[PDB]
Design a binder for these strands. Structure first.
Lengths: 98, 116, 164, 67, 166, 75, 416
RNA sequence: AUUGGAUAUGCCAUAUAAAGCGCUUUCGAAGAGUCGAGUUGUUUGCAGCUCUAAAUGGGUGGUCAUCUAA
RNA sequence: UUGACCUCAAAUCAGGUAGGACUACGCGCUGAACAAUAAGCGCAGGAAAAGAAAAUAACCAUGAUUCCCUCAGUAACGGUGAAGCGGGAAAAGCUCAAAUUUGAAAUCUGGCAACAUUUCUUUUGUUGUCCGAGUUGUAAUUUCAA
């Protein structure tokens, strides 16, 4: 008969199961179209005044001052490190094109 | 402010009248939905078995009930819970299977056009 | 005032002669009106009610989401962008997206003129994706004209901050 | 309760469907050219399969025509 | 689609294109009224994801508030008072300058038949949604009173509960 | 070592550049979306067929005037 | 079981070949076998029938996970094996599947978590799934099959194969190994993978044509040689299916060794082609690997072969090679092989200018467009898996020109 | 007298339609003056001000687990 | 020029809607004294609010919200003072934005004309037609559980 016996136990035997990956855990993965959209917009929109100054320091090989300015503007190191890498590749792509 | 419990026997009667009111509307089906059997999430209680919220999708797939059919025959679905072990899967798959054995599903009339 | 190059490019529109020739091809491929669509469908309804297989339709593509998806799919042969979209950032990326996808594009005047082709008050962008075999040479000549009168022209001007 | 459920389900059991005038003429024309066993080539004929029904839809059309 | 490009362009708010448009439109909005009707949203991507549909019964209103309580909360309330027959759906930030913060508020007409016959916005017709912004039921209003799920976010502890058998 | 020194920046001791196309200088040759093409684009429209059956129904029920009898009513 | 026999007789397979004499009977007992056979001996049935028996014997189910893992060096060989295993499991319930390089990895993960009992894998992709994919149940692995072990070693999957054996369980698991040649690497891998004491079993013509004109030259050539016997070798079965379908759609009736991926139809088609005095047949290198070549006036290598060492021995009426200018480095390899060759010259005027009409036909038809994308994608993926990376470099290949040959105005979006 | 959910049954039914399950040599978009950083006030939350992001990223926890905000 | 579009206005134009009152309970804002305290101000309903995890945990794991009991006068803090688990009452899940319907804006308000319908001659719709809205995006489809 349908009935739940609450308390006591049911069984101490264990057998670990392998679980798949949930769709929500896929968030943050980069898409082929989102990467294209961002590359187009980044060129179209231009650069912020603080990104222009940071790009100037990287061009003059003053990376110590560039990283300091990015952190002072953005707030943390890993945000500054990511921005410097993004702007460095912009310079490299600009140099290859021009 | 001081809370008083003079309506304690009046809440008991009111809640029982709701169960009777609910049962009148849905005459032969149970007043509650079947709940899974889970184990509480602590080292103090993991030996006990209690009732869960709903059955996982992996438990329903094994039992043979789809997640869209399940809600219609009184089987709750918990999209959040998962089966990290084979004992939780089998303990609740059998619970669903026993439920289906004791269940009578009354047929529904279906619209049926002439041709096509 | 001083305007960025991505917004300055919208002040350099296609010339009157090329735009007039562009709309001669566009007006051959107008979508059927709400009335003409109803007449065609009711005509097929009587052929079904009593008792009884076509070709793919031909028309100009419109809609901002629709056209941008056609450019990304490289399905568009010619993209005509309105020059006076009220929020400019709606079409401010379209010349760059058309450059990236190799789509011949032009900035034409009077977004109202674009809407008239599609029986609408207003269209932000029109796109010709694929036309009949009779108009292959007419579209090809237009695309060559847009290359010279819009892409070969300006170009160096579109990379400069306008205004001031 | 159980007796009523089985008897009523038996009454409401006609699940197979007939074909309309268009459905019958559609499937009949496909069969007359490609036989009755080759449904994969039946779906790939653009002229007769205008609606682009796949082999599984055409198979279900033929089955409903048999009964 | 074009709302992918519009919404990624809205993250670069101080880029060349966005800075020029911020300063040009901020001057334009200052010549208008404090609260003025908007023919169409200045951010069609942001309004669209906040519940706005380009159909009859949906209204966009712009309002400027002085910088220096929540700025967005006051914009919702001021517009709600200005249009007393509409329901404030949501609101968002469009522009700012050294003095003013500009917001656009999405309102819905609970009396229009295109609203009352649409099941997806039918809920706002019920009287329980009268002046949602006034009771802190909007997105910024809920955030203002710290409503949320988690440890990051009275009466039942200042009272003595005396049972019948105690 | 980092010498624990100072770099003269620590607190203790073109305004209008030209447009630069660093991404759109080249042309992408392939479509952006790799999703398969649905069959709906190679088959007659199902939206219109829905309306045709709906119109054909109301023609039988007499809700909509047919083209032949539309002209007769006009004259 | 009867289900095995009912499936086997569907393929039209009777009696039993020589290599299976020392492999099929002993392998049915669950003992490790070190097979060694040449090309075309029929090893596909050798390591599939006993393993399929063992799936039925243990009553495996998708909840149990993968029980048999078959490793193949190339996409085409793995796909051909997967097609055969599908035929053998026609009357079964044990799930089967294939994971290959360059395929949809996300889609493969969704299929692996559901439970694939018979998995056909490639060394590159299997290691990726065995390390990263979650929910892939393989703790119940019971049989392991390696086909063309020498080919795997020469490709450069020695490191990948080592991690596979270290990750996959070794206890109570049957293992296999098949290699045409026994080298030091093959013997070393067998010693570290196979169980101790195993049962051991034992003139050229080319045309320098650009990619965009590859099909147009081919079509014009076939029109000219309609009164002869033509056999064309392709790099994939999907490429075979599309070109065969397209050629029949432009009033050039041809035959293909694809059919509907039915083994009986391929034998019937080959038998009809051999019997017929005149005709044209299309097939891939793997399908024709080990088969008996009839008296054919023209043999055409439309796509470069993936095994140049085997191809140069197979050739030894007239031979043709459709070599792109970027593939001219293969000419130098021919000199090192000491094979006489001559260059074929063709006039651009005589080439059919039907490319514009070809694109219109492909775009208008749903199934032609679908086949064209599958053929183009598979041809590129087979190209990226070539052994001669220096000669047949995919990066040097012009993708815009290649897609023109398939009837595409623009290169479709295919990954790798 | 006014009503609600069912049952039975007649008629009508635009089904060339619409679904669930199953399988993959094909794909899979996810919310910004926000998150966050500094600082100043109200009672950690909230608020102002200055600055201002990311894409297996981000949040919260104990390399791992869990969650998927605006 | 005609003429479309965008504006800016006007009308004793048509159809609507807001105010004030109550305020025991409810949700915001504000605030002294002897504390989210009274007051002051704003806004609802028959309940309100909250609500389908950017939640807990460290387990054999749990599974929206709300309320009760317990945890507990405990941890923590500097006398204040929770929460996870656990036991109950009740249980129900979902909707968008971000995808090309593109082989066909498939969507919607209104006017008018008929046909119905009513707690009701007072109510609420249907069908047809025209106009408008809408491609600067209305339907179908999708919401990560996919």
């Amino acid at each position: 008969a349908p009935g739940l016996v609450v308390g006591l136990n049911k069984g101490k035997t264990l057998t670990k199961r392998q679980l798949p990956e949930r769709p929500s855990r896929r968030k943050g993965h980069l898409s082929k179209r989102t990467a294209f959209v961002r590359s187009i917009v980044r060129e179209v929109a231009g650069f912020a005044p603080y990104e222009r100054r940071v790009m100037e320091l990287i061009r003059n090989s003053q990376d110590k001052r560039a990283r300091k300015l990015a952190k002072k503007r953005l707030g943390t190191l890993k945000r500054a490190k990511g921005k410097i890498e993004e702007l460095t590749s912009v310079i490299q792509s600009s140099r290859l094109a021009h | 402010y001081v809370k008083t419990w003079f309506n304690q026997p009046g809440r008991k009667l009111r809640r029982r009248q709701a169960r009777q009111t609910k049962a009148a509307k849905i005459a032969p089906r149970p007043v509650e939905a079947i709940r899974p059997a889970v184990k509480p999430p602590t080292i103090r209680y993991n030996m006990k078995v209690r009732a869960g919220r709903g059955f996982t999708l992996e438990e329903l797939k094994a039992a043979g009930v789809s997640r869209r059919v399940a809600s219609t025959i009184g089987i709750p679905v918990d999209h959040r819970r998962r089966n990290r072990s084979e004992e939780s899967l089998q303990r609740n798959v059998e619970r669903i299977k026993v439920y289906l054995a004791h269940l009578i599903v009354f047929p529904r009339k279906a619209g049926q056009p002439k041709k096509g | 005032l001083k305007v960025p190059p991505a917004i300055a490019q919208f002040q350099k529109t296609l010339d009157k002669n090329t735009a007039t020739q562009v709309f001669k091809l566009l007006n051959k491929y107008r979508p059927e009106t709400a009335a003409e669509k109803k007449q065609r469908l009711v005509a097929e309804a009587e052929a079904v009610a009593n008792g009884k297989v076509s070709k793919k339709p031909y028309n100009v593509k419109y809609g901002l989401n629709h056209v941008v998806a056609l450019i990304e799919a490289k399905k568009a042969k010619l993209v005509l962008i309105a020059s006076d979209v009220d929020p400019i950032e709606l079409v401010v990326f379209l010349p760059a997206l058309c450059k990236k996808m190799g789509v011949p594009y032009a900035i034409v005047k009077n977004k109202a003129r674009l809407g008239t082709v599609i029986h609408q008050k207003t269209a932000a962008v029109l796109a010709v994706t694929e036309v009949r075999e009779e108009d292959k040479n007419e579209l090809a000549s237009i695309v060559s004209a847009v290359d010279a009168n819009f892409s070969a022209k300006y170009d160096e001007s579109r990379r400069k901050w306008g205004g001031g | 309760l159980e007796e009523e459920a089985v008897k009523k389900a038996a009454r409401q059991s006609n699940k197979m469907l007939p074909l309309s005038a268009f459905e019958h003429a559609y499937i009949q024309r496909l069969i007359n050219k490609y036989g009755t066993e080759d449904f994969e080539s039946m779906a790939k004929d653009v002229k007769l399969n205008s609606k682009l029904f796949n082999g599984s839809k055409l198979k279900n059309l033929y089955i409903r025509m048999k009964a | 689609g074009a709302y992918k490009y519009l919404e990624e362009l809205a993250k670069k708010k101080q880029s060349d294109v966005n800075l020029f448009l911020s300063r040009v439109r901020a001057w334009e909005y200052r010549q208008m009224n404090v609260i003025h009707r908007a023919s169409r949203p200045s951010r069609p991507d942001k309004a669209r994801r906040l519940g706005y549909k380009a159909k009859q019964g949906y209204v966009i209103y712009r309002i400027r508030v002085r910088r220096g309580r929540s700025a967005r909360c006051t914009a919702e309330e001021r517009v709600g008072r200005y249009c007393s027959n509409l329901r404030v759906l949501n609101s968002y930030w469009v522009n700012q300058d050294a003095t003013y913060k500009f917001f656009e508020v999405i309102l819905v007409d609970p009396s229009h038949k295109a609203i009352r016959r649409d099941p997806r916005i039918n809920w706002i017709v019920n009287p329980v949604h009268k002046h949602r912004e006034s009771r802190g039921l909007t997105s910024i209003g809920k955030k203002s009173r710290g409503i949320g799920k988690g440890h990051r976010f009275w009466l039942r502890h200042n009272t003595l509960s005396l049972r019948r058998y105690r | 070592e980092i010498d624990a020194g100072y770099s003269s920046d620590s607190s203790t001791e073109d305004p209008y550049p030209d447009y630069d196309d660093f991404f759109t200088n080249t042309v992408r040759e392939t479509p952006l979306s790799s999703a398969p093409e649905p069959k709906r684009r190679f088959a007659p429209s199902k939206h219109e067929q829905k309306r045709i059956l709906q119109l054909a129904y109301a023609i039988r029920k007499g809700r909509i005037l047919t083209s032949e009898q539309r002209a007769e009513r006009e004259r | 079981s009867e289900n095995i026999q009912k499936a086997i007789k569907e393929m039209g397979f009777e009696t039993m070949t020589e290599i299976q004499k020392r492999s099929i009977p002993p392998l049915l007992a669950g003992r490790d076998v070190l097979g060694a056979a040449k090309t075309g001996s029929g090893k596909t049935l050798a390591f599939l029938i006993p393993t399929i028996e063992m799936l039925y014997a243990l009553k495996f189910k998708p909840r149990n996970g993968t029980g048999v893992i078959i490793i193949s060096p190339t996409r085409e060989l793995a796909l051909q094996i997967f097609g055969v295993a599908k035929e053998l499991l026609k009357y079964h319930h044990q799930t089967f599947g294939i994971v290959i390089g360059g395929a949809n990895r996300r889609a493969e993960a969704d299929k692996l978590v559901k439970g694939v009992n018979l998995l056909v894998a490639t060394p590159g992709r299997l290691l990726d799934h065995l390390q990263n994919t979650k929910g892939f149940v393989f703790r119940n692995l019971r049989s392991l099959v390696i086909d063309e072990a020498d080919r795997i070693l020469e490709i450069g999957f020695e490191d990948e194969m080592r991690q596979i054996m270290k990750i996959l369980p070794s206890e109570n698991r049957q293992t296999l190994l098949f290699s045409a040649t026994q080298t030091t690497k093959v013997e070393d891998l067998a010693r570290i993978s196979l169980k101790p004491g195993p049962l051991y079993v034992n003139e050229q013509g080319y045309v320098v044509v650009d990619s965009d004109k590859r099909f147009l030259l081919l079509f014009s050539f076939l029109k000219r040689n309609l009164k002869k016997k033509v056999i064309v070798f392709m790099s994939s079965c999907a490429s075979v299916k599309y070109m065969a379908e397209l050629l029949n759609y432009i009033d050039l009736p041809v035959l293909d060794l694809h059919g509907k991926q039915k083994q009986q139809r391929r034998t019937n088609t080959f038998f009809e082609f051999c019997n017929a005095e005149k005709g044209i047949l299309l097939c891939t290198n793997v399908a024709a690997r080990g088969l008996d070549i009839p008296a054919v006036d023209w043999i055409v290598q439309y796509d470069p072969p993936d095994d140049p060492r085997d191809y140069i021995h197979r050739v030894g009426g007239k031979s043709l090679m459709f070599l792109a200018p970027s593939e001219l480095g293969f000419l130098r390899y021919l000199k090192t092989a000491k094979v006489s060759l001559n260059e074929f010259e063709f006039p651009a005027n005589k080439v059919a200018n039907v490319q514009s009409q070809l694109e219109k036909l492909v775009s208008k038809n749903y199934y032609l467009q679908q086949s064209a994308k599958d053929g183009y994608r598979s041809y590129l993926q087979a190209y990226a898996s070539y052994s001669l990376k220096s000669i047949f470099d995919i990066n040097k290949l012009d993708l815009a020109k290649v897609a023109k040959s398939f009837g595409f105005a623009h290169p479709p979006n295919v990954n790798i």
